[PDB]
Structure formats: structure tokens, C-alpha cells
Amino acid sequence: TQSYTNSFTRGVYYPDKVFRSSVLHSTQDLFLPFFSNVTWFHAPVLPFNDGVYFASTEKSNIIRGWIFGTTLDSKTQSLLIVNNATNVVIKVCEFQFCNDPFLDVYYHKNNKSWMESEFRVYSSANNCTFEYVSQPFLMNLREFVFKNIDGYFKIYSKHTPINLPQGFSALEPLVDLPIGINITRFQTLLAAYYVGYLQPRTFLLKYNENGTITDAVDCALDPLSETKCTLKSFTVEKGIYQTSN
């Protein structure tokens, strides 16, 4: 299932660790384009080009874990992320064979809702380098953006309650794990997917007095946004303005 939907100003994250109060900043980094189209996934390997935007909402904890890699073979190192009930394990260890993802013949939650101690997806645990354990990543709508720039793998997260809904929610950094591996493909795991891809765009964020982003404008959507970015302001007065060439 690849039903398409538009992203209404979703996928904004803090670019740096610095703090700014009551000032508009223009930055040129990877971002999800405003009003771009995303793909819903239901019950395949994604191309994972220049970052990714992951979002999912549900009242259960069915969704957990991700796998990254460029070949998923013994030739090249592969990465894993899996969340437990009380912890998370992130080990960049090679995996050779994947016969089939685990799937119960019944998988009915109307009678039995217990699915425990049934996780075995790695056929061979070869030599590897890094392993990180911390507080659970997941807890409402969950939004994650994964990047791989200069050998650093960065993960952002945010929990936005809903009643991709409209609004602005900034993604705060979570864990900058230094794997060093090349990533060209990714895939989600089970026990309602929003997938979007980033481009090297330029933005103009608005910083609150407390230091949080409230609004942003994409400098390549419509001529009004280009005028706003040129003037470095969110309100434009009457007149004629030169924007580009």
C-alpha cells in the first residue's frame, strides 16, 4: 500500500545545539520540503536517499524497531535499532540471513494479547563494533528524522498529541550515535507509516524568547516566501522586492 498524502509543515528539527532568543535565523541543511507528498504504508525495501522522516500514530505498542544498511549481506556492516519494553538496544552488527519476519498464524488480539519472548531475526551475529543501551525511544503521534552526515548518525524525536495534522512542532535531538557505516536502505519492524525524504533546502526559523522554534518558512516554495527570506522577516510591507535572478 502506497497511498499518498501531503505533509503540512511537518519535519522541522533543531539544526544546532546553540541557543537563540527572539531572532530569525536562516540555515541551509537537509529538510523535508513544505507541502511535499509522503507515502502511507500498510501491511519492500525503501531507497533512503538523503535522510528520512518517520511518523506513526496508534494507541498500542505494535510498532518498534528499525534496520538500516546498504547491502544487508556479509559484505558490508549493517545497523539495528530495537526497543524493548523498558530499554533500547542499538547494535551495529552484521546480519546474514532473514528467512521471514515473525508472524503468528492467528495474530488475533481479540482473545490473546500476549506476545513476549519471540524476537529472533538475526541469523548470524558476526563481529561488530558498537552497542548502545539507554532509555526507551518510544513512549499521541511519534515523529522521527534519521540523518547520516559526516559519519554521524543522528536521531530526532517528538511526541505531539493529536485530536499528518496541521501545525508546527520542532524535533529535538535525541541520540547522536557514531556508527560510521554507510546507509542506503532501511526497513521497519512489527511486534500506519509516514515516510518522507529530505532535500538540501534552506529555511528561516523563528526562535522564541525561551529558545524554541515556533514558526518557519521554506525559502523555495512560493515567491512570497522568497521575499520573506530576502527581507529576513515574516511580515512584508507594500512594495516591490527583488528576490532572485
Binding site: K17, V18, F19, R20, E172, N210
Partner: protein, 91 residues
């Protein structure tokens, strides 16, 4: 045998001095200025601070959960006020 090929030696620290023009180095953020406490509220993940002119304003020390401003210690020009040298010699 320890073969060689993230693994870096411990970097020692120095006591924190305030209200004096002191050279500082906070996680590689070299600079010079006076160190004073600030009534700001950084986010949990932020570490530095930067004003409209892209100049470091406030820095959070990596050890304790405190944030302090960075103000350059006083500089400026000097002037001499004197009457005519024939009239007098005081300045």
C-alpha cells in the same frame, strides 16, 4: 600488545572563576571575556548561546547544570585633555 588504528585521552579541568576577564575553553569553544551568571533558560539539550551578530553570548559549563554569560572585558580608546603647552603643563 596494544595495537593502534572516539578513543581519546582524558582532558583535565580547571576551577571556575567569575567576574574576571579570564580565558576560557568550554568543549573547544575558545574565547576571552568575563564570566557572570545569567537569568536565561536554555533547553535541556542546548549547550551554547549566540546573539544576532553570531557572537558567543552564554555558555553552559559541561560539569554542573549552570549557564553563564560571556561579556568582553573593558576596552576602548584614551584621550588627553590639555590647554596650550605655553599656558600650562598639566594634563
Amino acid at each position: 600488545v596494544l595495537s593502534f588504528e572516539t578513543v581519546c585521552g582524558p582532558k583535565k579541568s580547571t576551577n571556575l572563576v567569575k567576574n574576571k576577564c579570564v580565558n576560557f575553553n568550554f568543549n573547544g569553544l575558545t574565547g576571552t571575556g568575563v564570566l557572570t551568571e545569567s537569568n536565561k533558560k536554555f533547553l535541556p539539550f542546548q549547550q551554547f548561546g549566540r546573539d544576532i551578530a553570531d557572537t558567543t553570548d552564554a555558555v553552559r559549563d559541561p560539569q554542573t547544570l549552570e549557564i553563564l554569560d560571556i561579556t568582553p572585558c573593558s576596552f576602548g580608546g584614551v584621550s588627553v585633555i590639555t590647554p596650550g603647552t605655553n599656558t600650562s603643563n598639566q594634563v
